[PDB]
Amino acid sequence: GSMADEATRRVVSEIPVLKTNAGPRDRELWVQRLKEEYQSLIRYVENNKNADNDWFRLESNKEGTRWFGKCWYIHDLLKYEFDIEFDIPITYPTTAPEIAVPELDGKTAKMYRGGKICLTDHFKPLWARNVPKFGLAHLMALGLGPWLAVIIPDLIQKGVIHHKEKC
């Protein structure tokens, strides 16, 4: 009956659920968790496309311990592009990764020095509640997505970030 529970379900219900309790050091169990991660991510991207919200690309190193790509955010029909990266923590997936958006380092209070985004206190307990069912698709849907939808409009209004004019 919680609003929280229904809100989370509306966001993630068609993201494949992950299973394996494995982090970077866990050998064949980690290779299994990576298949679940890739399967979940690609489905999320396909859903995003059908919904005209194709808002990021990610790739990893060979070992899938280092992730990087781009996110896009649309405001007054202008599309803003931000480079993103994160490490997989040793205690993944019980512990949640920390997304960095390095270019916005020093440009908002809602970021740690060095470029790690600062989520509200509700993200981490929601992750902990769902271990190990949530992965990188969920981190993007529930972590970076909501952060961008407050911070980016703010930074554009304060003239802190400007649109890269292009053809």
Curated annotation (Swiss-Prot):
Ufmylated at Lys-124. Deufmylated by UFSP1. Changing T108I: In NEDSG; decreased ability to form thioester bond with UFM1; decreased protein ufmylation. Interacts with UBA5 (via C-terminus). Interacts with UFL1. Interacts with UFM1. Interacts with KIRREL3. GO terms for molecular function: UFM1 conjugating enzyme activity; UFM1 transferase activity. GO terms for cellular component: extracellular exosome. The active site is at C118. Pfam families: UFC1. E2-like enzyme which specifically catalyzes the second step in ufmylation. Accepts the ubiquitin-like modifier UFM1 from the E1 enzyme UBA5 and forms an intermediate with UFM1 via a thioester linkage. Ufmylation is involved in various processes, such as ribosome recycling, response to DNA damage, interferon response or reticulophagy (also called ER-phagy). There is a cross-link at K124 (Glycyl lysine isopeptide (Lys-Gly) (interchain with G-Cter in UFM1)). Belongs to the ubiquitin-conjugating enzyme family. UFC1 subfamily. Keywords: Disease variant, Isopeptide bond, Ubl conjugation, Ubl conjugation pathway. This is Ubiquitin-fold modifier-conjugating enzyme 1. In absence of UBA5, the active site is solvated by water molecules thereby reducing its nucleophilic activity. A linker region of UBA5 is required to reduce the amount of water molecules in the vicinity of the active site and elevate its nucleophilic activity. GO terms for biological process: brain development; protein K69-linked ufmylation; protein ufmylation; regulation of type II interferon production; response to endoplasmic reticulum stress; reticulophagy. Changing I42R: Abolished interaction with UFL1. It is linked to Neurodevelopmental disorder with spasticity and poor growth: An autosomal recessive disorder apparent soon after birth or in early infancy. NEDSG is characterized by axial hypotonia, delayed psychomotor development, poor feeding, failure to thrive, peripheral spasticity with hyperreflexia, poor overall growth, and microcephaly in most patients. Additional variable features include contractures, facial dysmorphisms, and ocular movement abnormalities.
